[PDB]
Amino acid sequence: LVWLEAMLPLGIIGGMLCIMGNSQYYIHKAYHGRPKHIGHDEWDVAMERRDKKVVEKA
Amino acid sequence: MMLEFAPIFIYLVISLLVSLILLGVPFLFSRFDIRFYLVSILFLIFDLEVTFFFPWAVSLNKIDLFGFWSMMAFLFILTIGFLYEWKRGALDWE
Amino acid sequence: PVMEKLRMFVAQEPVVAASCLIGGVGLFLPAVVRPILDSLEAS
Amino acid sequence: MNTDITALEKAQYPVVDRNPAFTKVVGNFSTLDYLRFSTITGISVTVGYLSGIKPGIKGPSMVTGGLIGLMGGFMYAYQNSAGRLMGFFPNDGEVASYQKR
Amino acid sequence: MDLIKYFTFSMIIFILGIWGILLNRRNILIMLMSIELMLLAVNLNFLVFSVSLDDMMGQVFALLVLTVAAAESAIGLAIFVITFRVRGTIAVEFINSIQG
Amino acid sequence: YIAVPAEILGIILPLLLGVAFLVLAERKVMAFVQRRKGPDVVGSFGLLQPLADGLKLILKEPISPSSANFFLFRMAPVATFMLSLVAWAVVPFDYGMVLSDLNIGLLYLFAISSLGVYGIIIAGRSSNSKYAFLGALRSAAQMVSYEVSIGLILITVLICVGSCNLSEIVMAQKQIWFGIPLFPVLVMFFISCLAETNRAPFDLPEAEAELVAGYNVEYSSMGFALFFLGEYANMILMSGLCTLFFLGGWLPILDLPIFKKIPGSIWFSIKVLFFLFLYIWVRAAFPRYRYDQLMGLGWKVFLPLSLAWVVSVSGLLVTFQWLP
Amino acid sequence: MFNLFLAVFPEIFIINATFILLIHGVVFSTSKKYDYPPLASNVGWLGLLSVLITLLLLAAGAPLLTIAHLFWNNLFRRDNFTYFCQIFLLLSTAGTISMCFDFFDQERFDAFEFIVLILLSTCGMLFMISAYDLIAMYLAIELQSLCFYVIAASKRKSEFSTEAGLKYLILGAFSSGILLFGCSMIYGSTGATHFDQLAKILTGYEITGARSSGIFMGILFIAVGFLFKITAVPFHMWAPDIYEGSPTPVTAFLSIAPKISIFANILRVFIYGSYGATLQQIFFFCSIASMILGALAAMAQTKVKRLLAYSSIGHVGYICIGFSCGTIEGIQSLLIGIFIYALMTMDAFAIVLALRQTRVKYIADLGALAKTNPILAITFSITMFSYAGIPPLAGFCSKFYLFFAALGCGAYFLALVGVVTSVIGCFYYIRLVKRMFFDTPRTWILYEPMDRNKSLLLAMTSFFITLFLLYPSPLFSVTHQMALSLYL
Amino acid sequence: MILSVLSSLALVSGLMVVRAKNPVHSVLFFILVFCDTSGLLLLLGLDFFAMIFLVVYIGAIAVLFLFVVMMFHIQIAEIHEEVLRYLPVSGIIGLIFWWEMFFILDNESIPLLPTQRNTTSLRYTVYAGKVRSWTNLETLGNLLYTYYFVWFLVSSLILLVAMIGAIVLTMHRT
Amino acid sequence: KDWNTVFERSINTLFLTEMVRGLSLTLKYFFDPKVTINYPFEKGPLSPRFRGEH
Amino acid sequence: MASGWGITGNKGRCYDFWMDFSECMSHCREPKDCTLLREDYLECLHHSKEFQRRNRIYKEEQRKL
Questions:
Q1: CATH number, domain at B77?
Q2: Which residue stretches, if any, does this entry annotate as coiled coil (chain C) (predicted)?
Q3: Per the structure, how many domains does chain H have?
Q4: Cβ-based contacts of I30 with chain A (< 8 Å)
Q5: Chain B residues with beta carbon closer than 8 angstroms to that of C34
Q6: Rounded to whole angstroms, what are the CA distances from H148 to C30, E64, G184, H144, H154?
Q7: Residues 6+ positions from F149 with CB-CB distance below 8 Å
Q8: Is G158 on the interface with J (CB under 8 A)?
Q9: Which of F167, F268, G396, H56 fits as disulfide partner to F250, beta carbons 3.0 to 4.6 Å?
Q10: Could you give all domains of chain E from N- to C-terminal order, each with its CATH number?
Q11: Does any CB of chain G come closer than 8 Å to the CB of residue B65?
């Protein structure tokens, strides 16, 4: 069972990677109010720019 | 959209800052080998081959058979070049 | 007698033989099989 | 891929077939076409043999010359046959076989 | 004023290539690099114009000129290597035998 | 954009910790294979050994030899370290968890790979030592040689996906992971990653005993540390690409509700950890090639196979109209 | 689908034959079993055969080269002008190859890649002739140029050959960059690279007060590149050094074929596009400079190869006078001048390659050649008098035009320059006849007799040179056809 | 402003390519000029060309230049010359080229002067083009291999010539 | 020699079959007990004949 | 913009003007008959006259201020 000692630095690396993903995911969501959308194209950009007017001017 | 490149720039600046902090904190307390030219040439040729493959791979669904066969002819010419290089011992480093 | 010359060529140089086979299937399919499928679709 | 066989200069002879298929042009090969094919191939084999004697590779040189001649002669024969079927070259025999079948 | 600014960027690179030819009469390697700077400036011209005109022909040609530039550099440096290997030096005084 | 630095730091700092602990895990797994214990005195189970080595390294006096290339000598490790860090901006850890959703992210990764050679070349030249220069030239040649195969394998994957977006590449593996039909491509990709990171059995810079002085022989203190950290960060990245391209990234092994209970970042981490174990397992298993042997392998074995696989995959997909 | 490619049958054949020869050469030159045989002559004979089969395919398929012209329109344009230009280019290449076998065997130049590069550059010039877009024009020009850079440095241990290749690469890449900058200006100003689109955009306006400076400078830079290619003064100084330093068969090839192909490009670009006066004044002033400088510099030379280089510079000046006038007779005379200069140069380089077996270098080496080989001294004297334009030799034809255009376009300073430079040329050409016939040197050089290929080529070209003015109808008719087919 | 920063960086880096004493430094400053060009291309929205300039110019061409220059060990004496005497000729040539070419577009492409009025409100958006937009990569790949495939193949012939000529000129087999 | 023996030789080359065996035996010692002595709490064995400090 | 291929995958901004000018020039034996269409195409390419007019407006605003 001594070989579990080796599994600790590997588990720490895996946790480091999980932090690198999740921490940046939750900060973007807090700043924008919704999760980051994969594949933001020209249409989505134009929809956001139009939605700004349709919301604020309402 | 090019909006997604701005985080890469800010990332570069931060990486630079980290590099300088790590590197700076300690400051506080005549023989030409032609085989390298030849490997450079080979790499350049196949670099251009990967470059011409990128648009082809994303466009295969529109160009269909004509595009496939024109790329095959391109590869055939460059592979004849590769066979020439092989037979001439440009791929041998002993 | 070009039948063991191919055998020796496979024995000496298996990577070249495998590359030729893999790429040859890649070329053979669109050249031969694909017009067969297109014709079978026409009828 | 959009295509268009239309030539700049119009065919001056009866157009038997505008865009004849590959196998149709090959099957249209005449006696003169085979004579051109054979002459080109034989000359090419001969040049390969004669130029191969000094380096000592007359046989391999013969095969190389024969391949060059085979490709060139087939291309020439195809050129003539397809031009006849398309009306670009005098095509008496093509028209005689067309008006009957 | 966007188009003029991109254009002058490329133009300054082209002029820098010309000056690099003018300023390196003892340094033939820098002359080859000046020619590569001119070629880069031309490629930029084609890409900028392609954008400005909404036309794709400038991008097709930019890619092909890339292939040509790579081939030119490979051959150019091969000739430089054989020139140096024959003479033992790159000094311009050893490549001036042909004249008149 | 004001919170962008928080995201960048939440990527960079844990990456530097993960690298510190990758060095430890490499020393532990190699030790256990060799019936030894490995670092277990400095901290409980040796878990403070990375901190101790880093602090030792920053407390070491810099040397800075009397060379005419003072600036380039210090800049080369910065260059390689920066290049190793900046590739992670486009790496997706889970659906939506990525800093930059580049539509050209595949070509961007290839470009960073291509830039990686300059740190080694410049370190070798600026050192004013013919041993360092020769070792550097050989390492640079090996890297560019295996970049050709890496790029042609990238083309195979791109043909299957039809998009350079890394998240799209992952999500195209929902039906099946690409490492199942393209298992030989995965094998050749893992080997080409070993040769690109200068790792065993291709680690020429490690072969000092073999009369081969590495490009970083003259470096000390933190410049030497930056070279080492860039190399190890590249190994985690190459394990992440093996995961993204062929093991379906953050996706679960089976599309079942029991497997979808654990999040995608855990799946991605576990696959990355499998590949990092294999990098160490190979170091522990085999001897190393000579330079000429691995160069022959690069040009005569992996270029032809990679090219043949591009042709075969594109032809098969075009024939049966299975293209994306 | 397959029948569309009937328009590219000659090119397909020559490219595939070049690949076959490359493979054959590299496979059997490395063979230990055949003791690494020199394959330069073997591949040379096979490549000469390939060129002749390409010529057969092209000439016997005249209407088929225009098939699918709309599908092929955005790639190239084949017509009667291109048909005849390509036939002449293939003939030049075949003659030049036939003149190389003695050089391969006796100097033991064993590299078969020489033949492969010559064939690839022939492909490039074939594509140059049919080019109908700035992009295609540049690509074909670059392919041809890269092949020449490599063959100019073929004697890779010789100081002269390495020096020639280095100057060629630098000056050639510089000129190509200038020309590419001109293409970018034209594209930016007109949004068009196709020759038809450029024709429509630019006709009817020329300099109409509000002239596009972008178009004008694109034209100027493209013109500078073309003038470098044809070795017109002041873009000429690469030519004498490269001509001397290159291996003599390379010098023979570079003297003929590239000029045919670049003049085809110049016609189809300028005569066909429409900026007008400035473009022709460019060529007028460069023609004058070329005639004067070529005559003086040739008069100063003591080596045969340099004399021939400067003579070619002078003659391109004479030819470009025809392009300057901008009429049907101007184009016809340009084509006639190109054809006659090419045949004469082929004669001269056949003789030079024959004398290179005993290492001819100086004009004085030809002393007492009328005793040691009287019929060779007569053949060479005929070539020199033809170069000088003495009637009734073929060289008079081109000289006759120079004065015909000078008195047609109303230019008497051009006429005076022509009279003075013709006299100077006559002097330095008859100096060789004096050396071979009138001198009595103390030490003689005995020359080895030439091989059959060069004797047959020399006999034919010499009969043409002496007897063309007796039956000149076919060339006149065909060049008139080409001049007309430029527009219709 | 940003274009001014990139232009200034490229101008200094280019001067350093043409004026550095050491050719290794010259090749390194050339890499900086190519990086700056990549930035300009990113501004124009051409991300494929921006990446390819990195991959080909820096990743492959500059590497070849660096390998050759480094192994040549050029001595500063063989290539040194004082350049003060060329200031007048550089001045005249550069000034002619400046006055004539930095202002070649001005008559044809007249700049729109920025006014103290919001002209952004007159940008007309057409949503039909935005339903399925094309990247630079697939827009180029739609043309390279079908409508303009002959030029593609001629470029392959150019590359073949480079490979042949490199072998023939420099190979000395052991 | 034979298409079947040629085939097996080629497959063994391409699929690194002998490199798998070296990996497998390397992993077997990963899980086994270690031989390291926890000095200075634990010591190595010595004999009554040991020649140490005079 | 005479080829038709736009940089975003649609018909080029100035292709229709080019085609109008070309179709006019294909049958009008005098180039002056198609001058208006030609300057329409070139105006599309460079927006010279539009920007000149807007600069006139801006200049008048600066003058009246």
A1: 1.20.58.1610
A2: none
A3: 1
A4: 3, 6
A5: 65
A6: 22, 11, 19, 5, 11
A7: F188, F192, F298, F302, F303, F305, F306
A8: no
A9: F268
A10: 2-87 (1.10.287.3510)
A11: no
